[PDB]
């Protein structure tokens, strides 16, 4: 298995890394582990203008007021349990958002603030028959309504909710109230069942209380029952949201139609579907085990053919101190991170199941040391029924002495491990910034990217619509439109000349600059910067971009093209002239 | 005979040999790489807003940025490291902001931006370089674009006698302006000699069959400043000297050396003999003899062209030059898409008419190189081991990732007689230029000092409230202001709940009293756009308004402990 990608060689896999609390998505080549691209999502990106431009702020909605995000879990849309390469979804824990990235243009094209919740943490996609739903955990219990009259998490109206988002429209589909709280989640290989771990079955707010119970649980959702209740109109709404809300709590011991609670020790964390579709595997964290939920026993559990919810557990292997996450090679082994022991442990799921039935046997195959304190791990295609068992990335939280010193803040250490053989082999230490939690890999042929924009692309269609009201054809017009104290500049661009090289406004005017890059070549991107106005954006081939700012300073102000595009790059410039307020009315 | 055969694989457990400091380009940060692995070890926020650490959101960072904290963007190109006696001393890194006309200082012991200045009365700081000898007293900075003076909207004509740009000197230690020099034309790039007397800059817009490199007599400038012979502009107290030619007469502070053609790069050879100006539109470099500049300013030379001692023909589109310390220069050919290696002394002899070939090798790069940088090339210790060429079009060299492409930063072994390309490093947002330093030239703190200037103003606020940041967990109420102070020790915030009134302006100050390297904590307030880092022994603070009634969770964002998920707290906001 080639480990090094020489000059002129291409990587075999795409890797999509979460940005952690830096808020972006990063695109890596695997196995070289080099960063090919950054995709801004919840961060403000100076280079492309994401969070400054009118297109990006329209996608972010009211949340464009936040300059931060915290993402953990990137996942790729699937058709029949295999990646189809259309979309990447990722969570925002800091401002309770889910974002969709369009993998053909590698940009965030949709974003939603999940109503009536705080902190979207766990996120995963339906696998079968395709990704109809994005499943998203809200982590923290809050009052409903949260109007400041009740603060107690033990009140009957204090709770958190499981969230399903329509992948294609990126509108809420439903929400399910649960007991306890929600950590990570996964889905089965039929479309019926999803599952989430809970660590706060105590509904406490202090550390001691959140650890009291010997077992919390994984809550299992019967999505068919949920949809059936929705189509039946048997749901409520909260506040101003029209999202159907269903009640998944126990009510005096009796289970909801929508949920079952499997007792699992202890403050469990990871929740991973095996690539063969047999198991939900929950990482015990404070318990030195994983718990294996048999998905094929779930219909019986929901029909009361089982006497005890624990009867869906068919294994609970002892793996080591602080199991956090599990991934799969597709050969019948699971790999689990041990945060405290700082290892990855390879174990055989079928043997662990036999040992739970008393058949004494050694299901642990190998323990590999990692550096240090691993969180997530990801084996190539592990989330599909094409799990290929080639590469394994383990994302550790303390790199200590593994890289040159760079001050008090250290990088993370994302370590690439060869699992194609019987023995795991550590091959590469990859330092990353801001704590990626999780990543996801796709084969090179599973991702198809556009090199030039289509002119009808929904990303800037609202801008095309604005132009039409001014009688503007964006493909050819270089025009300055005036409307009271607003000025709308429309221009084409072809290196090294802006189509409007100068224009004049009154001090205080609100200026929108719309630029259409009418180039038809690849890698031919232009920029636009207005000096000393905090204005910056990218316009790639056939794209239209626009940015709005206030001409608050009298005098002559230069604008320039930022993206090196030509041998005459530092000469693709223009001038905005701002007439002083004292020479105009008022 | 000596071969180029350095090892590029830094396996697990092994450490890189050099630090690389990459500019962030249009993204606005600075990036720290290990060389030769070319892996990114750290990002240093400067002009960007960084969700992870809170740079741009915290009180400490917005204090450093001053009024310019209102800008969420930057555009940097030129990172440089402070020198003592012509050698890197590891103290500071400086970098430019072309978009909002700033210079930033980074302290290399903490790897944080600690000072920032908006340069007055100019637009767009582009070229930037450091005084070398006797140390980096001055940061030299080019303002690129010509503007009216004053720029109040009465005059827009760029040919007006009061429309010009200026060369800028910033005091490196105080990060206050030292002086500005009005010049003719446009400034592009700049460098300094190895004595402290001279600096030089290419000018592309003298408007021209020839533009020039302008040469500054920094001693003469300092003399005038100390005798009070200067004017000031607008409301800036900065001494301003007039370096323009007047009726064909020369300023005391400047000489204009004719050089073709829209010259771009301006690079000082490591032996200190030459300012080398890359020809861009002319397929040449021009070599100015620094030891002839005293005679130039003394009026002992018949013609400003007399200080030119070499003009080698290299290829199409020379943009920049670097040095191996063995007597070779390395120049990027932007059109030919090559690095050309050439011998500077053979170039000088050729210029006299000897038939001697000074070109040693041309290496193909991919594609369209701009800047290049050999290790320690800006110092008299240039070691001739590694070369990075930063190329603007990666085309097919990496997997496709949509309409936007990465820059291709190519690592080249120059240790032997033949350059060898050994690695392609894709980078985001056109870093443009970089600088390398030996591992042993950089010394960083592992934990913060409690007296650090970075958060000294926050320590002062706490002093006014009577707070001992090392021990106290308290909530001060002051009208509609709320100042929460707390220690933190994973897995617990030192204040786990507090209550305020809707609309209160809340300041949260957190001190990480851990003593263990790498145990960094975070603080995020859910749905309030609040996020910051607190590393060991650091104090950080952030102000926001509690505009939403009800219970609002905060949590630690830096995975710090087995019980990370449970290190949380509650803000309770009583309705108005
Ligand atoms: Cu948010 S948690 Cu184990 Cu995913 Cu990092
Ligand atoms: Cu247009 Cu560079
Ligand atoms: Cu504090 Cu994780
Ligand atoms: Ca618990
Ligand atoms: Ca010119
Ligand atoms: Cl998980
Ligand atoms: Cl230069
Ligand atoms: K870390
Ligand atoms: K580029
Ligand atoms: Na939306
Ligand atoms: Na300052
Ligand atoms: Zn440059
Ligand atoms: Zn350049």
From Swiss-Prot, chain B:
One Pfam family named in its UniProt record: nos_propeller_2
Positions annotated to bind Cu cation Z3: 78, 371
The record's free-text note on cofactor binding: Binds 2 calcium ions per subunit.
Sites where the protein binds Cu cation A2: 556, 558, 560, 564
Subcellular location: Periplasm
Residues annotated as binding Cu cation Z2: 77, 126
Keywords: Calcium, Copper, Metal-binding, Oxidoreductase, Periplasm, Signal
Cofactor entry: Ca(2+); Cu cation
Catalytic reaction(s) noted: N2 + 2 Fe(III)-[cytochrome c] + H2O = nitrous oxide + 2 Fe(II)-[cytochrome c] + 2 H(+)
EC number: 1.7.2.4
CDD domains per the UniProt record, alphabetical: N2OR_C
Residues reported in the UniProt entry to bind Ca(2+) 1: 392, 407
Chain sites annotated for binding Ca(2+) 2: 204, 207, 211, 262
Region (COX2-like): 480-576
Post-translational modification: Predicted to be exported by the Tat system. The position of the signal peptide cleavage has not been experimentally proven. The N-terminus is blocked.
UniProt: Cu cation Z1 binding residues: 264, 320
Keyword hit for Metal-binding: yes
Residues the entry annotates as binding Cu cation A1: 521, 556, 560, 567
Associated pathway: Nitrogen metabolism; nitrate reduction (denitrification); dinitrogen from nitrate: step 4/4
Family of this protein: Belongs to the NosZ family. In the C-terminal section; belongs to the cytochrome c oxidase subunit 2 family.
HAMAP family: NosZ (MF_00716)
Name of the protein this chain belongs to: Nitrous-oxide reductase
């Amino acid at each position: 298995q080639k480990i090094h990608v020489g000059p002129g060689e291409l990587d075999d896999y795409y890797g999509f890394w979460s940005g952690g609390h830096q808020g972006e998505v990063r695109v890596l080549g695997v196995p070289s582990m080099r960063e090919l691209m950054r995709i801004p999502v919840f961060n403000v990106d100076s280079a492309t203008g994401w969070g400054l431009t009118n297109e990006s702020r329209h996608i972010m909605g009211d949340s464009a007021k936040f300059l931060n995000g915290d993402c953990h879990h990137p996942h790729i849309s699937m058709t029949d349990g295999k990646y189809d390469g259309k979309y990447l979804f990722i969570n925002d824990k800091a401002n309770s958002r889910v974002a969709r990235i369009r993998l053909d243009i590698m940009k965030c094209d949709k974003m939603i603030t999940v109503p009536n919740v705080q902190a979207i943490h766990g996120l995963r996609l339906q696998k079968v028959p395709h990704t109809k739903y994005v499943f998203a955990n809200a982590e923290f219990i809050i009052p409903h309504p949260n109007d400041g009259k009740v603060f107690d998490l033990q009140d009957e109206n204090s709770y958190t909710m499981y969230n399903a988002i329509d992948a294609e429209t990126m509108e809420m589909a439903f929400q399910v109230i649960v007991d306890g709280n929600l950590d990570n989640t996964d889905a089965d290989y039929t479309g019926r069942f999803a599952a989430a771990t809970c660590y706060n079955s105590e509904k406490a707010f202090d550390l001691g209380g959140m650890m009291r119970n010997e077992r919390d649980w994984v809550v299992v959702f019967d999505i068919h029952a949920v949809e059936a209740a929705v189509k039946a109109g048997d749901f409520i709404t909260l506040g101003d949201s029209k999202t159907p809300v269903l009640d998944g709590r126990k009510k005096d011991g009796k289970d909801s139609k929508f949920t079952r609670y499997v007792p699992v020790p202890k403050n469990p964390h990871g929740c991973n579907t095996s690539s063969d579709g047999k198991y939900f595997i929950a990482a015990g964290k404070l318990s030195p085990t994983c718990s294996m939920i048999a998905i094929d026993k779930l219909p019986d559990l929901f029909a009361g053919k089982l006497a005890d919810p624990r009867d869906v557990i068919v294994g609970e292997p002892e793996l080591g101190l602080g199991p956090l996450h599990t991934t799969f090679d597709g050969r019948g082994n699971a790999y689990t991170t041990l945060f405290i022991d700082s290892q990855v442990v390879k174990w055989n799921m079928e043997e662990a199941v036999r040992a739970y039935k008393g058949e004494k046997v050694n299901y642990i195959k190998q323990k590999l040391d990692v550096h240090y304190q691993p969180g997530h791990l990801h084996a190539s295609l592990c989330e599909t029924n094409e799990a290929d068992g080639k590469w394994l990335v383990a994302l550790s939280k303390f790199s200590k002495d593994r890289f040159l010193p760079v001050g008090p803040l250290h990088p993370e250490n994302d370590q690439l491990i060869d699992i194609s053989g019987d023995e795991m082999k550590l091959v590469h230490d990859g330092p990353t910034f801001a704590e990626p939690h999780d990543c996801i890999m796709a084969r090179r042929d599973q991702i198809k990217t556009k090199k030039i924009w289509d002119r009808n692309d929904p990303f800037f269609a609202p801008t095309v619509e604005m132009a039409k009201k001014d009688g503007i054809n964006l493909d050819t017009d270089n025009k300055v439109i005036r409307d009271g104290n607003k000025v709308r500049v429309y221009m084409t661009s072809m290196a090294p000349a802006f189509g409007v090289q100068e224009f004049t406004v009154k001090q205080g005017d609100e200026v929108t600059v719309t630029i259409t890059n009418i180039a038809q070549i690849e890698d031919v991107s232009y920029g636009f910067v207005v000096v000393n106005h905090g204005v910056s954006m990218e316009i790639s081939p056939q794209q239209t971009s626009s940015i709005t700012f206030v001409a608050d300073k009298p005098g002559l102000h230069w604008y320039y093209c930022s993206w090196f595009c030509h041998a005459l790059h530092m000469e693709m410039v223009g001038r905005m002239m701002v007439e002083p307020a004292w020479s105009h009315p008022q």
